[PDB]
Subunit: 98 residues, 7 copies
């Protein structure tokens, strides 16, 4: 069991997505980069430094947060047949809560 | 309303107000490109974007309930309860409409 | 009791004081590209764009009633009550025309 | 009456003067791309652009009467009384020509 | 024993990934540099100057850190049959710690 | 006669380069303007206003300076036929001195 | 040598330390896209760029004699007495190689 620690304002997200199944039985993956997804925040970076080496701008997401994000610019990472993505917090569109 | 979408930064959630326009023959042809502006209702607003330094969030100029005119370009479609929603940057909001 | 359009940021609502480009055979050739500058009347103005400190809005240099020369590029057409309007950035306004 | 034009921001109104481009065959050829720079006279100047903070308009470096060298690109042609004028950003002005 | 010193916010990384063979014995390299990799930070730049130009903003990686990064924009450098990459600290996605 | 006064951070440069024939007596000029040239600074603008709005950032070239520069983005100006160029101080690569 | 080149801003003059690579037949083939990074010696350095304030020049992180790795892209070739030189921004310098 490894432990990934995102840098700057990048976060690690666990893809809660599932490929769509065609009626004929074919399964087409979601190569869709523009297609936004819903996942869970697993790790967050410290935050980006401001103009001067003063303070880190806290992120607006935390571990456990369910979020909607864009895959574009993201980096896929698999671990124990698990899908993960490393993306900038600016790609996160919104947080979904119950 | 079990689920609740909370936009980040200066993005907002808008509920599209419109209807599939029909052709004289009885056909409906939507707008996939999303290049025409639209009218909708602000459902949720983000906190806003952090200023240069990072000590203040510049408040947005729209609020829940506001009817606005916006550009779908760059926006993201989200359906829920057969309802159409769009997540866009407040910069895409052109004006607020008020009777 | 009537719909009123309110421009966000430094955008302004302008009304049409010109007609479509005419021809020698009578055919009306509209401009879809919107590359020719036009002349219109400022109908509504936005509050202005926030400075940086998030402190003050930089007032615009146009007011309702002003006749202005502007670029249609980047503008958004809006028709209401049968009149043609345009929502554009205050940066697209070239000059104010006064008697 | 004779309406006057009032440039906004750092834009200025310039009056153009062009030589006879008559080719040998008595054919004159205009510059559509407006790539070639020209010489003209500053007729009106804008107040100047606001600063980031919002405490001053940075004065322009040209004044009425100044003969200047400028790029037509980005400029907007305006013909009043047969004469040709141009509205351009002060950034397009290259140099001021003085006797 | 020449030693490389990265400038600004660039870091020198040692690629520790391994060419993969095809079922035919062939070997296929990744020239486009679009796939992220895992490596070890060998040297780090002082960091970028702040707005005011008085202090540099320290980087969030240190020598010995195992990182996940994007090869895009990076520059390959070989020395003693060892593969190295000079990249911007912005290309480093996360630090991997056992 | 007349004296050109550059605005902002633009400068007037007098081209010193001259044409070069071929083995056939032919001459090929540089329409592209991608080759850098050597010339003399004739007049310099006041300099660009700081973002603040209270100070002109002095340029690093003075009249009489021989400089190497890029013609790209430059504007040609012929007077008494002397070939001149109006370019941004940012196109000035270096100053050549004895 | 007599004439000496003095780089401006944060640009530096580097002396190309790269060589030819003859093919088995004889004929040697050189670079041409300028994407391949090179190694060379810093011969001269500019004073550095003035911050936004304009009160101070941010010193460069390279000095004369430094052996550096750099990108030729954006560089400008300069020959003299047979030796090849390049004028590039200090931003193209990747690292300093020391022994
Ligand atoms: Ca701060």
């Amino acid at each position: 069991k490894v432990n990934i620690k995102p840098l700057e304002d990048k976060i690690l997200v666990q893809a809660n997505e599932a490929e769509t199944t065609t009626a004929s039985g074919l399964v087409i993956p979601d190569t869709a980069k523009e297609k936004p997804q819903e996942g869970t925040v697993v790790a967050v970076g410290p935050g980006r430094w401001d103009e001067d080496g003063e303070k880190r701008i806290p992120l607006d997401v935390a571990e456990g947060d369910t979020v909607i994000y864009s895959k574009y610019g993201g980096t896929e990472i698999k671990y124990n047949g698990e899908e993960y993505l490393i993306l900038s917090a600016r790609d996160v569109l919104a947080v979904v809560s119950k």
